[PDB]
Ligand binder design. Structure first.
Ligand code: FAD
Length: 453
């Protein structure tokens, strides 16, 4: 139990009621430091621990693909916490109003939440802090090394963040203790009813094709903590050996496919790292996978934590802002509207095929995501519009959307964040360029296009 994983958000007088875990980013019962630290405080206070999840009003800004994935996993989580005598309460509305009301009604003694550097999470914290008088703690349950401990500033490159993260691995990469159940039963609606009403509200905005048929295919990834562990086990046994060799081939399914589970926190990345470290596979493919799930994943939290404007043009490096400004008035080859990007109606068949994998599966290949966003910058009127369009289609149709990985991934493609300067071209400036012929020399672009008609 490392005290560097927990941070105090507000001091106060501890009540004599249950310890409340405001779960948000990490929706899992196992390998949850936030839940484990809440249980330890409750045990030392001779009081039970309870879980409170908030069903926010911002769900209509996404889709059914994300609403169903999250709520189906929360239904499985409700049973898991019930087996540990840990009751869960699912509130509907503003977190600033619901959490403050729950704390006062249930005589909460201490409040704990998990860590997320997103702007919307800091908005909820500001509202909750003003409405409570009990101690308020937060715990980094998503990163192996706490985001405030890995680096005290923003790291501009992966080769500067890698030696800092690996130096702290022997301290923070440890096994998880077992979640002790409550000593006894500690004495607001059914999730199935909340899913039915929310789906009916999202139905008019459902992504459809010409035949009025749904575009999304929900049989590619089954939600839940149990289905997440099966994906990890199958990846280590079948795909890890060839990961470093075929991670850049969109025609092969050699990725772990763990991001939808990782985003909603249905599986701990620290658990995935532990099982991969003890696995005996290709040393080149192991170094490649640990680079993505540790460095690039946690450098995205570093970027969002230390950059308030992580979604804006001001967070770009000075060399990128000066390069893009010098080419702002360059006549773009094409200018597509948001509705043309959304429906995949560009002159690039490779770009259209990437958008149809996004629309149909909700998880577009990691390599084509780089090409998909860089073409948005090439076919937009300004880098600012390219950011809005990329963020919109990302958060709406990706299952792992609305994640620090997405904003840091978009900043890398459009603004060269965590990148270097390259050959100066028109429109795109010194931002790294990915051409269509360059992709034809890396993989079979025809098979990727034909798969997503
Ligand atoms: C423009 C763009 C947008 C993206 N949007 C998202 C997004 O909204 N949500 C999201 O989770 N990822 C996003 N990615 C990052 C990355 O593509 C995905 O994490 C990865 O594709 C997830 O699929 P996977 O788990 O099968 O990949 P794997 O190769 O199996 O990697 C495993 C995990 O490592 C992490 N990871 C891998 N690559 C990256 C990366 N480049 N940056 C950060 N973490 C990484 C992921 O958590 C990933 O789940 C985006 C990338 C780009 C270029």
């Amino acid at each position: 139990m490392n005290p560097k994983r927990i941070r105090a958000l507000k001091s106060g007088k501890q009540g004599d009621g249950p310890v409340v875990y405001w779960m948000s980013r990490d929706q899992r019962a196992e390998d949850n430091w936030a839940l484990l630290f809440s249980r330890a405080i409750a045990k030392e206070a001779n009081v039970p621990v309870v879980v409170v999840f908030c069903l926010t009003d911002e769900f209509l800004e996404a889709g059914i693909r994300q609403y169903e994935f999250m709520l189906k996993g929360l239904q499985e989580l409700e049973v898991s916490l019930s087996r540990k005598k840990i009751p869960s309460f699912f509130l509907r509305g503003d977190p600033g109003e619901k959490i403050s009301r729950f704390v006062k009604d249930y005589n909460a003694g201490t409040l704990v939440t998990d860590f997320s550097p997103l702007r919307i999470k800091n908005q909820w914290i500001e509202k909750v802090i003003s409405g409570i008088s009990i101690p308020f703690f937060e715990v980094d349950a998503h990163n192996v090394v706490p985001c405030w401990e890995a680096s005290q500033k923003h790291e501009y490159a992966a080769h500067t963040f890698r030696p800092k993260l690996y130096a702290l691995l022997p301290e923070f990469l440890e096994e998880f203790p077992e979640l002790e159940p409550n000593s006894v039963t500690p004495e607001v609606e059914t999730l199935s009813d909340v899913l039915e009403t929310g789906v009916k509200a999202l139905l008019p905005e459902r992504a459809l094709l010409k035949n009025k048929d749904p575009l999304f295919e929900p049989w590619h990834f089954e939600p839940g903590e149990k289905a997440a562990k099966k994906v990890m086990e199958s990846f280590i046994a079948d795909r890890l050996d060839s990961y470093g060799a075929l991670r850049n081939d969109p025609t092969k399914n050699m990725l772990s496919n763990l991001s939808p589970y990782l985003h909603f926190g249905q599986i701990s990345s620290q658990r995935v790292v532990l099982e991969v470290e003890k696995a005996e596979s290709n040393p080149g493919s192991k170094k490649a996978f640990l680079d993505e799930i540790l460095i690039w994943k946690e450098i995205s939290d570093n970027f969002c934590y230390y950059n308030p404007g992580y979604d804006g043009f001001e967070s770009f490096p000075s060399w990128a802002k000066e390069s893009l400004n010098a080419h702002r008035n360059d006549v773009r080859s094409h200018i597509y509207t948001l509705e043309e990007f959304e429906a995949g109606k560009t002159h690039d068949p490779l770009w259209n095929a990437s958008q149809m994998e996004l629309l149909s599966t909700g998880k577009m290949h990691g390599y084509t995501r780089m090409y998909w966003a860089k073409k948005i910058l090439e076919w937009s009127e300004s880098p600012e519009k390219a950011l809005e369009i990329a963020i919109c289609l990302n958060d709406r149709y990706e299952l792992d959307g609305r994640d620090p990985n997405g904003y840091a991934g978009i900043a890398w493609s459009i603004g060269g964040v965590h990148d270097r300067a390259w050959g100066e071209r028109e429109v795109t400036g010194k931002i790294r360029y990915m051409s269509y012929e360059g992709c034809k020399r890396k993989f079979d672009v025809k098979l990727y296009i034909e798969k997503y008609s």
